[PDB]
Amino acid sequence: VIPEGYTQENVAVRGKATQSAQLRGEHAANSEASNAIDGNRDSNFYHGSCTHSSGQANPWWRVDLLQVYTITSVTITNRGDCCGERISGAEINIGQHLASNGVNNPECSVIGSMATGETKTFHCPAPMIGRYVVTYLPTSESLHLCEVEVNVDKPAAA
Ligand SMILES: C[C@@H]1O[C@@H](O)[C@@H](O)[C@H](O)[C@@H]1O
Ligand SMILES: [Ca+2]
Ligand SMILES: [Cl-]
Numbered sequence: 001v002i003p004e005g006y007t008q009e010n011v012a013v014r015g016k017a018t019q020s021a022q023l024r025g026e027h028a029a030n031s032e033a034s035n036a037i038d039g040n041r042d043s044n045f046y047h048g049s050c051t052h053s054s055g056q057a058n059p060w061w062r063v064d065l066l067q068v069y070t071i072t073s074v075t076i077t078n079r080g081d082c083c084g085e086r087i088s089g090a091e092i093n094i095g096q097h098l099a100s101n102g103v104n105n106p107e108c109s110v111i112g113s114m115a116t117g118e119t120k121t122f123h124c125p126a127p128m129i130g131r132y133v134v135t136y137l138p139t140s141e142s143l144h145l146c147e148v149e150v151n152v153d154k155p156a157a158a
Contacts, residue, residue: 001073001153003153005155006155006156007153007156007157008072008151008153008154009152009154010075010149010150011065013038014065014066015037015064015066016034016063016064017034017037017051018061018064020053020054020058020061021053021056021059022052023142024054027045027046029048030052031050031051033061034051035146036146037147037148039147040146040147042146043116043119045080045146046081049147050079050145051143051146052143052144053137053142055142057140058139059137059143060135060143061148062101062133063132063134063148064132065131065133065150067131068096068131069152070127071094071127071128071130072123072151072152072153073122073123073124073151074108074122074124074133074149074151075120075121075122075147075151076114076119076149077119077147078146079117079145080116081117083144084118086139086141086142086143087113087141087143087145088114088139088141089110089112089137090143091107091135091137092110092134093105093108093134093135093136094106094124094132094133094134095132097131097132102132103136106128108124108125109124135148
């Protein structure tokens with residue numbers, strides 16, 4: 001992706017994030033859904049820039065972009081201090097409307113697996129129209145995202 005004449009922008013920092021259920025207890029303060037769109041890829045969960053679900057099965061995290069965009073890819077930063085294997089199987093769904101918390105929207109990509117602390121771009125089959133981007137983890141693992149960037153192409157500046 002990223003053709004001549006165009007520039008790419010992360011429109012996720014313009015939105016509002018939320019998740020199925022936040023991690024409770026001792027580290028609950030470092031777990032806010034908003035952490036995945038604060039413009040910081042720091043993957044050390046203890047620095048406070050990563051989200052963390054409750055631990056209950058099939059968690060999801062979502063960002064409402066506030067308006068519809070044509071999205072080319074989504075760049076994810078996996079947790080780095082530990083537990084990089086938990087995100088395996090995660091699905092990135094993108095849609096104009098919220099079809100069951102975004103969990104049932106069209107799929108951009110599936111995260112096979114990512115090394116601990118890895119930042120990787122997942123390109124959608126074709127550009128997708130959507131206002132909501134959801135990361136659904138259909139397993140018994142905790143979902144922790146250190147950054148979710150939603151990439152939109154724009155004609156370049158100058
Ligand atoms: C915030 C915590 O980080 C590590 O201690 C993990 O083993 C826990 O399951 C939890 O994710
Ligand atoms: Ca972050
Ligand atoms: Cl905000």
